[PDB]
Amino acid sequence: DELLTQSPATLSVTPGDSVSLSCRASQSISNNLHWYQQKSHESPRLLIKYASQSISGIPSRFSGSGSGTDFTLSINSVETEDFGMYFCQQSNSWPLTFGGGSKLEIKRADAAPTVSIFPPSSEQLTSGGASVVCFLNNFYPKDINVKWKIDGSERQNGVLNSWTDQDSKDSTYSMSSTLTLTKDEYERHNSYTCEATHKTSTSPIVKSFNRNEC
Protein backbone atom coordinates (compact mmCIF):
# COMPACT_ATOMS: atom_id res chain seq x y z
CA ASP A 1 0.00 0.00 0.00
CA GLU A 2 1.72 3.28 -1.10
CA LEU A 3 1.20 6.47 0.97
CA LEU A 4 1.25 9.63 -1.08
CA THR A 5 1.81 12.63 1.12
CA GLN A 6 0.79 15.92 -0.28
CA SER A 7 2.06 19.35 0.71
CA PRO A 8 0.72 21.80 1.39
CA ALA A 9 -2.79 20.71 2.40
CA THR A 10 -4.33 24.27 2.24
CA LEU A 11 -2.70 27.30 0.50
CA SER A 12 -3.89 30.72 -0.49
CA VAL A 13 -2.43 32.45 -3.51
CA THR A 14 -2.43 35.77 -5.17
CA PRO A 15 -3.37 35.35 -8.85
CA GLY A 16 0.10 35.95 -10.27
CA ASP A 17 2.28 33.84 -7.90
CA SER A 18 3.89 30.59 -9.01
CA VAL A 19 3.15 27.70 -6.62
CA SER A 20 4.74 24.29 -6.02
CA LEU A 21 2.72 21.28 -4.74
CA SER A 22 4.74 18.27 -3.42
CA CYS A 23 3.68 14.61 -3.52
CA ARG A 24 5.95 12.36 -1.48
CA ALA A 25 5.92 8.54 -1.82
CA SER A 26 6.81 5.98 0.84
CA GLN A 27 8.39 3.91 -2.00
CA SER A 28 10.15 4.16 -5.43
CA ILE A 29 7.41 4.35 -8.24
CA SER A 30 9.55 6.15 -10.81
CA ASN A 31 7.31 7.85 -13.39
CA ASN A 32 4.12 6.09 -12.31
CA LEU A 33 2.86 9.29 -10.74
CA HIS A 34 -0.13 11.21 -12.14
CA TRP A 35 -1.79 14.56 -11.15
CA TYR A 36 -5.50 15.48 -11.34
CA GLN A 37 -7.34 18.77 -11.00
CA GLN A 38 -10.85 18.99 -9.51
CA LYS A 39 -12.68 22.37 -9.74
CA SER A 40 -15.66 23.11 -7.46
CA HIS A 41 -18.73 21.08 -8.30
CA GLU A 42 -16.80 19.29 -11.18
CA SER A 43 -15.16 15.85 -11.63
CA PRO A 44 -11.37 15.31 -11.44
CA ARG A 45 -9.44 15.97 -14.66
CA LEU A 46 -6.23 14.42 -15.92
CA LEU A 47 -3.45 17.03 -16.07
CA ILE A 48 0.01 15.50 -15.82
CA LYS A 49 0.72 11.99 -17.01
CA TYR A 50 3.87 10.43 -15.51
CA ALA A 51 4.99 13.52 -13.60
CA SER A 52 6.29 15.56 -16.57
CA GLN A 53 4.09 14.57 -19.50
CA SER A 54 0.97 16.66 -19.72
CA ILE A 55 -2.16 15.76 -21.66
CA SER A 56 -3.41 18.64 -23.89
CA GLY A 57 -5.66 21.71 -23.87
CA ILE A 58 -4.02 22.53 -20.54
CA PRO A 59 -1.75 25.58 -20.25
CA SER A 60 2.02 25.27 -20.48
CA ARG A 61 1.86 27.03 -17.11
CA PHE A 62 1.46 23.66 -15.37
CA SER A 63 4.70 21.66 -15.13
CA GLY A 64 5.15 18.15 -13.70
CA SER A 65 8.59 17.26 -12.35
CA GLY A 66 10.03 14.35 -10.36
CA SER A 67 11.01 10.72 -10.14
CA GLY A 68 11.40 8.47 -7.16
CA THR A 69 9.69 9.45 -3.87
CA ASP A 70 9.27 13.16 -4.60
CA PHE A 71 7.23 14.63 -7.49
CA THR A 72 6.10 18.23 -7.85
CA LEU A 73 3.48 20.12 -9.85
CA SER A 74 4.52 23.63 -10.69
CA ILE A 75 1.92 26.31 -11.56
CA ASN A 76 3.80 29.35 -12.90
CA SER A 77 1.24 32.18 -12.64
CA VAL A 78 -1.87 31.51 -10.61
CA GLU A 79 -5.14 32.30 -12.34
CA THR A 80 -8.71 32.34 -11.15
CA GLU A 81 -9.51 29.29 -13.46
CA ASP A 82 -6.80 27.39 -11.55
CA PHE A 83 -8.27 27.22 -8.02
CA GLY A 84 -9.67 23.92 -6.79
CA MET A 85 -8.18 20.71 -5.47
CA TYR A 86 -5.10 18.99 -6.84
CA PHE A 87 -4.52 15.27 -6.38
CA CYS A 88 -1.58 12.99 -7.18
CA GLN A 89 -2.14 9.34 -7.96
CA GLN A 90 0.33 6.46 -8.28
CA SER A 91 -0.35 3.65 -10.83
CA ASN A 92 2.98 1.85 -10.20
CA SER A 93 1.30 -0.77 -8.04
CA TRP A 94 -2.21 -1.97 -7.25
CA PRO A 95 -3.89 -0.92 -5.08
CA LEU A 96 -3.78 2.35 -6.98
CA THR A 97 -3.58 5.03 -4.27
CA PHE A 98 -4.08 8.82 -4.20
CA GLY A 99 -2.71 11.60 -1.97
CA GLY A 100 -4.93 13.65 0.44
CA GLY A 101 -5.28 16.72 -1.83
CA SER A 102 -3.90 20.25 -2.12
CA LYS A 103 -6.74 22.78 -1.95
CA LEU A 104 -5.92 26.08 -3.67
CA GLU A 105 -7.69 29.30 -2.68
CA ILE A 106 -7.64 32.82 -4.22
CA LYS A 107 -6.24 35.40 -1.83
CA ARG A 108 -8.22 38.61 -2.31
CA ALA A 109 -8.71 41.77 -0.26
CA ASP A 110 -10.56 41.47 3.04
CA ALA A 111 -14.31 42.12 2.90
CA ALA A 112 -17.03 42.81 5.48
CA PRO A 113 -20.16 40.64 5.61
CA THR A 114 -23.63 42.21 4.92
CA VAL A 115 -25.77 40.53 7.55
CA SER A 116 -29.54 40.29 7.53
CA ILE A 117 -31.58 38.63 10.29
CA PHE A 118 -34.93 36.82 9.91
CA PRO A 119 -37.49 36.00 12.58
CA PRO A 120 -39.47 32.69 12.44
CA SER A 121 -42.22 32.37 9.80
CA SER A 122 -45.87 32.27 11.02
CA GLU A 123 -46.06 29.13 8.99
CA GLN A 124 -43.24 27.63 11.08
CA LEU A 125 -44.94 28.81 14.23
CA THR A 126 -47.90 26.47 13.66
CA SER A 127 -45.76 23.35 13.90
CA GLY A 128 -44.58 24.52 17.26
CA GLY A 129 -41.07 25.57 16.19
CA ALA A 130 -39.12 28.78 15.60
CA SER A 131 -35.92 29.12 13.51
CA VAL A 132 -34.27 32.56 13.58
CA VAL A 133 -31.83 32.94 10.70
CA CYS A 134 -28.93 35.26 10.01
CA PHE A 135 -27.13 35.37 6.56
CA LEU A 136 -23.47 36.73 6.69
CA ASN A 137 -22.89 37.54 3.00
CA ASN A 138 -19.83 37.98 0.82
CA PHE A 139 -16.98 38.31 3.36
CA TYR A 140 -13.23 37.59 3.15
CA PRO A 141 -11.31 35.96 4.90
CA LYS A 142 -13.45 32.91 5.78
CA ASP A 143 -12.90 33.03 9.57
CA ILE A 144 -15.80 34.89 11.06
CA ASN A 145 -17.27 34.35 14.55
CA VAL A 146 -21.02 34.46 14.99
CA LYS A 147 -22.79 34.50 18.34
CA TRP A 148 -26.50 34.34 19.19
CA LYS A 149 -27.80 36.53 22.13
CA ILE A 150 -31.41 36.21 23.40
CA ASP A 151 -32.37 39.22 25.47
CA GLY A 152 -28.58 39.90 25.86
CA SER A 153 -27.21 36.47 26.99
CA GLU A 154 -25.26 34.17 24.64
CA ARG A 155 -27.06 31.16 23.21
CA GLN A 156 -24.96 28.17 22.18
CA ASN A 157 -27.68 25.57 22.34
CA GLY A 158 -29.41 24.82 19.07
CA VAL A 159 -27.09 26.59 16.57
CA LEU A 160 -26.14 25.19 13.13
CA ASN A 161 -23.74 26.99 10.81
CA SER A 162 -23.08 26.52 7.09
CA TRP A 163 -20.34 28.23 5.07
CA THR A 164 -20.27 28.28 1.28
CA ASP A 165 -17.17 27.38 -0.67
CA GLN A 166 -15.20 30.31 -2.19
CA ASP A 167 -17.13 32.16 -4.81
CA SER A 168 -15.99 31.99 -8.42
CA LYS A 169 -17.18 35.52 -9.10
CA ASP A 170 -15.43 37.49 -6.37
CA SER A 171 -13.54 35.02 -4.10
CA THR A 172 -15.76 35.58 -1.13
CA TYR A 173 -17.40 33.24 1.28
CA SER A 174 -20.86 33.20 2.68
CA MET A 175 -22.55 31.84 5.74
CA SER A 176 -25.84 30.88 7.15
CA SER A 177 -26.36 30.63 10.91
CA THR A 178 -29.46 29.03 12.27
CA LEU A 179 -30.84 29.10 15.82
CA THR A 180 -33.80 26.78 16.46
CA LEU A 181 -36.14 27.34 19.39
CA THR A 182 -39.60 26.05 20.24
CA LYS A 183 -42.52 28.45 19.71
CA ASP A 184 -42.90 28.36 23.51
CA GLU A 185 -39.38 29.53 24.39
CA TYR A 186 -39.60 31.90 21.36
CA GLU A 187 -42.81 33.58 22.67
CA ARG A 188 -40.96 34.24 26.02
CA HIS A 189 -38.00 36.37 24.93
CA ASN A 190 -38.00 39.79 23.28
CA SER A 191 -34.81 40.45 21.45
CA TYR A 192 -32.85 38.27 19.03
CA THR A 193 -29.28 39.33 18.14
CA CYS A 194 -26.65 37.82 15.92
CA GLU A 195 -23.16 39.16 16.31
CA ALA A 196 -20.40 38.61 13.75
CA THR A 197 -16.81 39.29 14.61
CA HIS A 198 -14.62 39.45 11.50
CA LYS A 199 -10.96 40.69 10.97
CA THR A 200 -12.36 43.63 9.10
CA SER A 201 -13.51 45.44 12.31
CA THR A 202 -12.79 45.77 16.02
CA SER A 203 -16.48 45.95 16.91
CA PRO A 204 -18.81 42.97 16.34
CA ILE A 205 -21.28 43.67 13.49
CA VAL A 206 -24.72 43.15 15.03
CA LYS A 207 -28.17 42.95 13.47
CA SER A 208 -31.26 42.57 15.76
CA PHE A 209 -35.02 42.41 15.90
CA ASN A 210 -37.60 42.68 18.59
CA ARG A 211 -40.54 40.31 18.57
CA ASN A 212 -43.96 42.12 18.25
CA GLU A 213 -46.08 42.25 15.03
CA CYS A 214 -49.75 43.03 14.30
Binding site: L46, Y50, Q89, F98, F118, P119, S131, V133, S162, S176
Partner: protein, 227 residues
Protein backbone atom coordinates in the same frame (compact mmCIF):
# COMPACT_ATOMS: atom_id res chain seq x y z
CA UNK B 1 -17.02 12.48 -27.17
CA UNK B 2 -15.82 9.87 -24.63
CA UNK B 3 -18.67 10.39 -22.16
CA UNK B 4 -19.08 8.22 -19.00
CA UNK B 5 -22.48 8.49 -17.16
CA UNK B 6 -23.23 6.77 -13.84
CA UNK B 7 -26.71 5.87 -12.52
CA UNK B 8 -28.06 3.72 -9.68
CA UNK B 9 -26.92 5.63 -6.58
CA UNK B 10 -29.34 6.00 -3.63
CA UNK B 11 -30.26 5.34 -0.01
CA UNK B 12 -29.46 1.86 1.30
CA UNK B 13 -29.56 0.50 4.88
CA UNK B 14 -26.30 -0.86 6.32
CA UNK B 15 -26.00 -4.46 5.11
CA UNK B 16 -28.30 -3.98 2.06
CA UNK B 17 -27.16 -3.79 -1.63
CA UNK B 18 -27.02 -1.40 -4.60
CA UNK B 19 -26.08 -1.95 -8.30
CA UNK B 20 -24.48 1.10 -10.12
CA UNK B 21 -24.11 1.47 -13.95
CA UNK B 22 -21.84 3.68 -16.07
CA UNK B 23 -22.70 4.22 -19.72
CA UNK B 24 -19.76 4.74 -22.09
CA UNK B 25 -19.92 6.59 -25.44
CA UNK B 26 -17.41 8.22 -27.83
CA UNK B 27 -15.16 5.17 -27.81
CA UNK B 28 -14.68 1.52 -28.55
CA UNK B 29 -15.33 0.14 -25.07
CA UNK B 30 -13.89 -3.38 -25.23
CA UNK B 31 -10.38 -1.92 -25.79
CA UNK B 32 -10.33 -0.12 -22.48
CA UNK B 33 -9.87 -0.99 -18.95
CA UNK B 34 -12.10 0.90 -16.54
CA UNK B 35 -12.19 1.45 -12.79
CA UNK B 36 -14.56 2.69 -10.11
CA UNK B 37 -13.31 5.47 -7.77
CA UNK B 38 -15.21 6.95 -4.77
CA UNK B 39 -14.87 10.50 -3.45
CA UNK B 40 -15.62 10.70 0.31
CA UNK B 41 -17.53 13.54 1.99
CA UNK B 42 -14.21 14.78 3.48
CA UNK B 43 -13.09 15.01 -0.10
CA UNK B 44 -10.62 12.04 -0.39
CA UNK B 45 -10.29 9.90 -3.48
CA UNK B 46 -10.16 6.11 -3.15
CA UNK B 47 -9.87 3.43 -5.84
CA UNK B 48 -12.27 0.50 -5.37
CA UNK B 49 -12.17 -1.90 -8.42
CA UNK B 50 -10.48 -2.33 -11.86
CA UNK B 51 -11.66 -4.43 -14.83
CA UNK B 52 -10.02 -5.20 -18.20
CA UNK B 53 -11.04 -4.57 -21.77
CA UNK B 54 -12.19 -8.23 -21.95
CA UNK B 55 -13.42 -9.10 -18.41
CA UNK B 56 -10.84 -11.22 -16.60
CA UNK B 57 -8.24 -9.78 -14.24
CA UNK B 58 -10.50 -7.93 -11.79
CA UNK B 59 -8.51 -5.97 -9.14
CA UNK B 60 -9.76 -4.81 -5.71
CA UNK B 61 -8.32 -2.94 -2.67
CA UNK B 62 -8.51 -5.12 0.59
CA UNK B 63 -11.47 -3.13 1.88
CA UNK B 64 -13.90 -3.97 -0.95
CA UNK B 65 -12.68 -7.49 -1.56
CA UNK B 66 -15.66 -9.69 -0.86
CA UNK B 67 -18.53 -7.15 -1.03
CA UNK B 68 -18.29 -5.45 -4.36
CA UNK B 69 -18.22 -7.02 -7.86
CA UNK B 70 -17.07 -5.07 -10.92
CA UNK B 71 -18.72 -6.33 -14.15
CA UNK B 72 -18.94 -4.97 -17.75
CA UNK B 73 -21.17 -5.65 -20.80
CA UNK B 74 -18.92 -4.76 -23.80
CA UNK B 75 -21.99 -5.16 -26.00
CA UNK B 76 -24.32 -2.69 -24.29
CA UNK B 77 -21.20 -0.64 -23.39
CA UNK B 78 -21.92 -0.58 -19.67
CA UNK B 79 -19.71 -0.79 -16.62
CA UNK B 80 -21.16 -2.10 -13.41
CA UNK B 81 -20.48 -2.11 -9.68
CA UNK B 82 -22.62 -4.45 -7.53
CA UNK B 83 -22.27 -3.46 -3.90
CA UNK B 84 -23.20 -5.71 -1.04
CA UNK B 85 -22.73 -5.98 2.71
CA UNK B 86 -22.93 -2.17 2.69
CA UNK B 87 -21.72 -0.27 5.73
CA UNK B 88 -21.81 3.45 6.58
CA UNK B 89 -18.24 4.09 5.44
CA UNK B 90 -19.21 3.25 1.78
CA UNK B 91 -21.17 6.50 1.83
CA UNK B 92 -19.67 8.61 -0.98
CA UNK B 93 -19.87 9.70 -4.65
CA UNK B 94 -18.96 6.92 -7.12
CA UNK B 95 -17.22 7.74 -10.40
CA UNK B 96 -16.45 5.41 -13.29
CA UNK B 97 -13.09 6.19 -14.96
CA UNK B 98 -11.25 4.72 -17.93
CA UNK B 99 -7.61 3.76 -18.35
CA UNK B 100 -5.34 4.34 -21.35
CA UNK B 101 -5.32 1.87 -24.24
CA UNK B 102 -4.37 -1.57 -22.89
CA UNK B 103 -1.44 -3.35 -24.51
CA UNK B 104 0.67 -6.39 -23.79
CA UNK B 105 3.88 -4.34 -23.93
CA UNK B 106 5.08 -6.36 -21.02
CA UNK B 107 3.11 -4.79 -18.18
CA UNK B 108 2.80 -1.03 -17.79
CA UNK B 109 0.80 1.51 -15.74
CA UNK B 110 -2.69 2.90 -15.35
CA UNK B 111 -3.77 6.53 -15.38
CA UNK B 112 -7.45 7.55 -15.43
CA UNK B 113 -7.81 9.93 -18.35
CA UNK B 114 -11.61 10.34 -18.48
CA UNK B 115 -14.06 10.55 -15.59
CA UNK B 116 -17.81 10.28 -14.98
CA UNK B 117 -20.08 12.79 -13.06
CA UNK B 118 -20.49 10.46 -10.08
CA UNK B 119 -23.59 8.82 -8.53
CA UNK B 120 -24.14 9.37 -4.79
CA UNK B 121 -24.56 6.34 -2.50
CA UNK B 122 -25.65 6.95 1.17
CA UNK B 123 -25.62 4.07 3.66
CA UNK B 124 -28.08 5.02 6.39
CA UNK B 125 -30.86 3.63 8.53
CA UNK B 126 -32.46 7.13 8.67
CA UNK B 127 -35.75 7.16 6.68
CA UNK B 128 -36.88 9.34 3.82
CA UNK B 129 -38.73 12.37 5.07
CA UNK B 130 -39.53 15.25 2.74
CA UNK B 131 -38.77 18.85 3.66
CA UNK B 132 -40.71 21.67 5.28
CA UNK B 133 -40.45 24.88 3.31
CA UNK B 134 -40.49 28.18 5.23
CA UNK B 135 -40.35 31.67 3.76
CA UNK B 136 -37.79 34.10 5.24
CA UNK B 137 -39.15 37.61 4.60
CA UNK B 138 -37.48 40.68 6.09
CA UNK B 139 -39.08 43.19 8.42
CA UNK B 140 -40.19 46.25 6.46
CA UNK B 141 -38.74 48.49 9.13
CA UNK B 142 -35.47 50.15 8.24
CA UNK B 143 -33.06 48.26 6.05
CA UNK B 144 -30.06 50.12 4.61
CA UNK B 145 -30.64 50.01 0.81
CA UNK B 146 -31.75 49.78 -2.78
CA UNK B 147 -31.44 46.00 -2.35
CA UNK B 148 -33.42 43.68 0.01
CA UNK B 149 -32.42 40.03 0.80
CA UNK B 150 -34.88 37.15 0.92
CA UNK B 151 -34.63 33.47 1.84
CA UNK B 152 -36.17 30.07 2.23
CA UNK B 153 -35.33 27.43 4.86
CA UNK B 154 -35.62 23.80 3.68
CA UNK B 155 -35.90 21.80 6.89
CA UNK B 156 -36.19 18.31 8.18
CA UNK B 157 -35.53 16.17 5.20
CA UNK B 158 -33.70 12.98 4.32
CA UNK B 159 -31.67 12.05 2.32
CA UNK B 160 -29.74 14.59 0.19
CA UNK B 161 -30.24 16.21 -2.25
CA UNK B 162 -32.91 18.86 -2.76
CA UNK B 163 -33.15 21.38 -5.68
CA UNK B 164 -33.94 25.00 -4.98
CA UNK B 165 -34.55 27.52 -7.72
CA UNK B 166 -35.84 31.12 -7.46
CA UNK B 167 -38.71 32.25 -9.72
CA UNK B 168 -38.48 28.94 -11.57
CA UNK B 169 -34.82 29.49 -12.66
CA UNK B 170 -35.39 33.11 -13.82
CA UNK B 171 -33.82 34.77 -10.77
CA UNK B 172 -30.21 33.63 -11.29
CA UNK B 173 -27.87 36.33 -9.93
CA UNK B 174 -27.69 37.17 -6.19
CA UNK B 175 -28.38 33.58 -5.13
CA UNK B 176 -26.53 31.83 -2.36
CA UNK B 177 -27.48 28.23 -1.63
CA UNK B 178 -25.91 27.02 1.60
CA UNK B 179 -24.72 23.47 1.92
CA UNK B 180 -26.99 21.14 3.88
CA UNK B 181 -25.90 20.24 7.44
CA UNK B 182 -27.01 16.98 8.92
CA UNK B 183 -28.21 16.96 12.49
CA UNK B 184 -30.49 14.52 14.28
CA UNK B 185 -30.85 12.47 11.11
CA UNK B 186 -32.49 15.37 9.16
CA UNK B 187 -30.67 17.91 6.95
CA UNK B 188 -31.51 21.67 6.87
CA UNK B 189 -30.55 23.90 4.00
CA UNK B 190 -31.04 27.62 3.29
CA UNK B 191 -31.02 29.76 0.15
CA UNK B 192 -30.93 33.54 -0.03
CA UNK B 193 -31.64 35.87 -2.97
CA UNK B 194 -30.88 39.64 -3.32
CA UNK B 195 -33.21 41.72 -5.52
CA UNK B 196 -33.72 45.52 -5.91
CA UNK B 197 -35.96 47.13 -3.25
CA UNK B 198 -38.51 48.37 -5.89
CA UNK B 199 -39.49 44.99 -7.26
CA UNK B 200 -40.33 44.17 -3.55
CA UNK B 201 -43.88 43.12 -2.71
CA UNK B 202 -44.66 44.44 -6.22
CA UNK B 203 -42.96 41.55 -8.01
CA UNK B 204 -43.33 38.05 -6.56
CA UNK B 205 -40.34 36.08 -5.49
CA UNK B 206 -41.06 32.35 -5.13
CA UNK B 207 -38.54 29.66 -4.17
CA UNK B 208 -39.08 26.28 -5.84
CA UNK B 209 -37.94 23.21 -3.85
CA UNK B 210 -37.88 19.62 -5.04
CA UNK B 211 -36.78 16.65 -3.06
CA UNK B 212 -36.70 13.80 -5.55
CA UNK B 213 -36.36 11.07 -2.91
CA UNK B 214 -39.78 11.89 -1.44
CA UNK B 215 -41.08 12.96 -4.85
CA UNK B 216 -41.97 16.21 -3.04
CA UNK B 217 -42.35 19.73 -4.66
CA UNK B 218 -43.24 22.98 -2.88
CA UNK B 219 -43.64 26.50 -4.42
CA UNK B 220 -43.41 29.16 -1.68
CA UNK B 221 -44.14 32.82 -2.30
CA UNK B 222 -42.31 35.27 -0.08
CA UNK B 223 -42.98 38.82 -1.42
CA UNK B 224 -40.72 41.09 0.72
CA UNK B 225 -43.55 42.03 3.10
CA UNK B 226 -44.41 43.64 6.39
CA UNK B 227 -43.34 40.58 8.14
Amino acid sequence: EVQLVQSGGGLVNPGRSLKLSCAASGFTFSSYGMSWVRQTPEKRLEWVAAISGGGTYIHYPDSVKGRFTISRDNAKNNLYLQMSSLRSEDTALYYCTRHPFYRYDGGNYYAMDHWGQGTSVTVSAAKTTPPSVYPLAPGSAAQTNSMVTLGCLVKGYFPEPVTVTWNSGSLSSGVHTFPAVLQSDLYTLSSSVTVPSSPRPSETVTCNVAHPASSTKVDKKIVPRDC
